[PDB]
């Protein structure tokens, strides 16, 4: 499974969904997750993310390990997203800000 980590929060560019062959992204208010059972590990999404927030599960940074289980959980409750849309309004003000998990909205 690939995993969306911290820098996606309050950015949510959604360029990542265009390239997904199996449509395994699920949408929240200010974040996207990858559904771990559905992802086929084709890796096509991770050089598409402007925020460089997508990682292979086995390559998630130490200090972002919480995001593996978070992706799995929220992929259960959030609606599937298959079409790109506009980035959130202030997305590049927030691109690169660390510790954005305190800002995650359900
Ligand atoms: S690695 Fe491939 S299958 Fe998994 S989320 Fe990214 S684009 Fe979709
Ligand atoms: S910011 Fe998030 S919505 Fe996709 S393009 Fe990057 S993982």
UniProtKB/Swiss-Prot annotation:
<feature type="domain" description="4Fe-4S ferredoxin-type 1">
    <location>
        <begin position="1"/>
        <end position="29"/>
    </location>
</feature>
<dbReference type="InterPro" id="IPR054829">
    <property type="entry name" value="FdxA"/>
</dbReference>
<feature type="binding site">
    <location>
        <position position="16"/>
    </location>
    <ligand>
        <name>[3Fe-4S] cluster</name>
    </ligand>
</feature>
<dbReference type="GO" id="GO:0046872">
    <property type="term" value="F:metal ion binding"/>
</dbReference>
<keyword id="KW-0479">Metal-binding</keyword>
<keyword id="KW-0408">Iron</keyword>
<dbReference type="GO" id="GO:0051539">
    <property type="term" value="F:4 iron, 4 sulfur cluster binding"/>
</dbReference>
<feature type="binding site">
    <location>
        <position position="45"/>
    </location>
    <ligand>
        <name>[4Fe-4S] cluster</name>
    </ligand>
</feature>
<dbReference type="InterPro" id="IPR022569">
    <property type="entry name" value="Fd_C"/>
</dbReference>
<dbReference type="Pfam" id="PF00037">
    <property type="entry name" value="Fer4"/>
</dbReference>
<dbReference type="InterPro" id="IPR017896">
    <property type="entry name" value="4Fe4S_Fe-S-bd"/>
</dbReference>
<keyword id="KW-0238">DNA-binding</keyword>
<keyword id="KW-0004">4Fe-4S</keyword>
<keyword id="KW-0249">Electron transport</keyword>
<dbReference type="InterPro" id="IPR017900">
    <property type="entry name" value="4Fe4S_Fe_S_CS"/>
</dbReference>
<feature type="binding site">
    <location>
        <position position="42"/>
    </location>
    <ligand>
        <name>[4Fe-4S] cluster</name>
    </ligand>
</feature>
<dbReference type="GO" id="GO:0003677">
    <property type="term" value="F:DNA binding"/>
</dbReference>
<feature type="compositionally biased region" description="Basic and acidic residues">
    <location>
        <begin position="95"/>
        <end position="106"/>
    </location>
</feature>
<feature type="binding site">
    <location>
        <position position="8"/>
    </location>
    <ligand>
        <name>[3Fe-4S] cluster</name>
    </ligand>
</feature>
<feature type="binding site">
    <location>
        <position position="49"/>
    </location>
    <ligand>
        <name>[3Fe-4S] cluster</name>
    </ligand>
</feature>
<dbReference type="GO" id="GO:0009055">
    <property type="term" value="F:electron transfer activity"/>
</dbReference>
<feature type="region of interest" description="Disordered">
    <location>
        <begin position="83"/>
        <end position="106"/>
    </location>
</feature>
<feature type="domain" description="4Fe-4S ferredoxin-type 2">
    <location>
        <begin position="30"/>
        <end position="59"/>
    </location>
</feature>
<protein>
    <recommendedName>
        <fullName>Ferredoxin-1</fullName>
    </recommendedName>
</protein>
<keyword id="KW-0411">Iron-sulfur</keyword>
<comment type="function">
    <text>Ferredoxins are iron-sulfur proteins that transfer electrons in a wide variety of metabolic reactions. This ferredoxin could play a role in regulating gene expression by interacting directly with DNA.</text>
</comment>
<keyword id="KW-0677">Repeat</keyword>
<dbReference type="GO" id="GO:0051538">
    <property type="term" value="F:3 iron, 4 sulfur cluster binding"/>
</dbReference>
<dbReference type="InterPro" id="IPR000813">
    <property type="entry name" value="7Fe_ferredoxin"/>
</dbReference>
<feature type="binding site">
    <location>
        <position position="20"/>
    </location>
    <ligand>
        <name>[4Fe-4S] cluster</name>
    </ligand>
</feature>
<keyword id="KW-0003">3Fe-4S</keyword>
<dbReference type="InterPro" id="IPR050294">
    <property type="entry name" value="RnfB_subfamily"/>
</dbReference>
<dbReference type="Pfam" id="PF11953">
    <property type="entry name" value="DUF3470"/>
</dbReference>
<feature type="binding site">
    <location>
        <position position="39"/>
    </location>
    <ligand>
        <name>[4Fe-4S] cluster</name>
    </ligand>
</feature>
<keyword id="KW-0813">Transport</keyword>
